[PDB]
């Protein structure tokens, strides 16, 4: 998939030593035409029993269950997509679903209710089929989320900073500690450099992408 492209893009920026070569002109790497369409605005890790629930920035929700199936609820509050482990998709609604999906729909509704009532929406200030969560994992320092549109999002726990990587735009959005949201073209970070903080996070991102590539299926 496009993970290989993402890895190549990150190799290229990291190899350019963007924080170690003199005048850094990070602002000139910003490219508003690359702003992502979707990212994860909230998440709930209940994976010891059920799975990982999440909200996308369009107020849709989803769950990646521990059996590797997914349920997606569109922001209309009724339309549902069910995705099997193999990626096979079917459509239904909360109002009309097979009884076999009863338990999973109930769980989705609990996750949805929780993420409607609680937590801050990441990227809240910011305004193409709906992606689903292909896979995820967590380390001690971050949660890594891989969307079916090829995007990879990394949220760092301690300082609340976040990266949204898109291999189609070859771009990274960095959400900093003050929740400022800036989208950069990766090749322009090569061209113009960046601060050591972003540089360090892009090195970490490369390692996370290698982990995704080495743990497929």
């Amino acid at each position: 998939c496009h993970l290989s492209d993402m890895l190549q893009q990150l190799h290229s920026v990291n190899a350019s030593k963007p924080s170690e070569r003199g005048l850094v002109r990070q602002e000139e790497a910003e490219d508003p035409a690359c702003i992502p369409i979707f990212w994860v605005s909230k998440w709930v890790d209940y994976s010891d029993k059920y799975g990982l629930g999440y909200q996308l920035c369009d107020n849709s929700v989803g769950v990646l269950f521990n059996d590797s199936t997914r349920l997606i609820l569109y922001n209309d509050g009724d339309s549902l997509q069910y995705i099997e482990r193999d990626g096979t998709e079917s459509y239904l609604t909360v109002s009309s679903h097979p009884n076999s999906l009863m338990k999973k729909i109930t769980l989705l509704k609990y996750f949805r209710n929780y993420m409607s009532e609680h937590l801050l929406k990441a990227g809240a200030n910011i305004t193409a089929r709906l992606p689903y969560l292909r896979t995820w994992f967590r380390t001690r320092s971050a949660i890594i989320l891989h969307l079916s549109n090829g995007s990879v999002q990394i949220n760092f726990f301690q300082d609340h900073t976040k990266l949204i990587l898109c291999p189609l735009m070859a771009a990274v959005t960095y959400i900093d500690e003050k929740r400022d949201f800036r989208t950069y073209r990766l090749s322009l970070l090569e061209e113009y450099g960046c601060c050591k903080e972003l540089a360090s996070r892009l090195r970490y991102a490369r390692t996370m992408v290698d982990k995704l590539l080495s743990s497929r299926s």
């Binding site: 909230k42 998440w43 709930v44 890790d45 209940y46 937590l119 801050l120 990441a122 949220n155 726990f157 609340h160």
Partner: peptide, 5 residues
Amino acid sequence: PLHST
């Protein structure tokens, strides 16, 4: 953490 901010 077990959920987001």
